Symmetry: C3
Subunit: 113 residues, 3 copies
């Protein structure tokens, strides 16, 4: 019956991986500012984070393009200038990315002192 147990094991093994990846989806983060408002939506997909932008008219693709399997975001206004920080994580490594009005740059964030 060992071969029959293998047939059952193969079926259980195909079910266990089908179910894993079936329930798998992309992960997003969002932030907004002003009264219009502007909206930025960051999507982690297959180890890549990309950005979509809304400034009142329609949606378009933003500059942000960095690696990661997970993303979070916060932002604040200095008067009307927007400042954005995006936290991108692969494995156990979190990288901070900074928008301060003139391009994305790597930030000072570290996970442990």
């Amino acid at each position: 019956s060992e071969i029959a147990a293998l047939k059952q094991e193969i079926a259980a093994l195909k079910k266990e991986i089908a179910a894993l990846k079936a329930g798998a989806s992309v992960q997003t983060a969002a932030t907004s500012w002003g009264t219009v408002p502007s909206i930025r939506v960051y999507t982690a997909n297959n180890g890549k984070i990309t950005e979509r932008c809304w400034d009142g008219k329609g949606w378009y693709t933003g500059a942000f393009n960095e690696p990661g399997d997970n993303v979070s975001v916060t932002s604040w206004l200095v008067g009307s200038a927007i400042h954005i920080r995006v936290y991108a994580s692969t494995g156990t490594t979190t990288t901070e990315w900074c928008w301060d009005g003139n391009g994305w740059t790597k930030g000072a964030y570290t996970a442990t002192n």
Copy 2:
């Protein structure tokens, strides 16, 4: 020893799926507004997103009830009117949902132009 390798493989196979789903949990997103404040907490559970609300007294169930395995949220005030956008993702499909004071509606967001 092939049958013995199968016994070991079955044990490794039961460990590999137990560990996967054991570490699995629901995913949440949160937003807030005002000085009271009001709080909204969105929970993705088994392909369903639902909403819990706090307006200063206690917690209750909100109107939001849409499919998705992942959720993010942002909100803004126009004077004292709250506007909410919720980003719900299943597989590779992200759907935007809009609260503007008179019911949830599907938003214009798309992932690629």
Copy 3:
């Protein structure tokens, strides 16, 4: 050929778990306040959530240290006092944690009434 199918099954079984955990990473949430600003970044890692803080000078470790596999956060100001709510989830159990200026405390949030 059953033993040969087992050799193939073992290879498929080692690929299916390698790929799972390979794509696995930590999950983060972020919030900010003021014009400096202050930033708080919460990281869920191996069932533990910890906190990193920025108040204008550099990054340091905060007080927050609670269990969970997933985290979300929101915050608001009452004048200049910061109030924070962190939502920590293990399995299907979401616990709210409250910062109101004098230590973290468990909040009134429940998932269903």
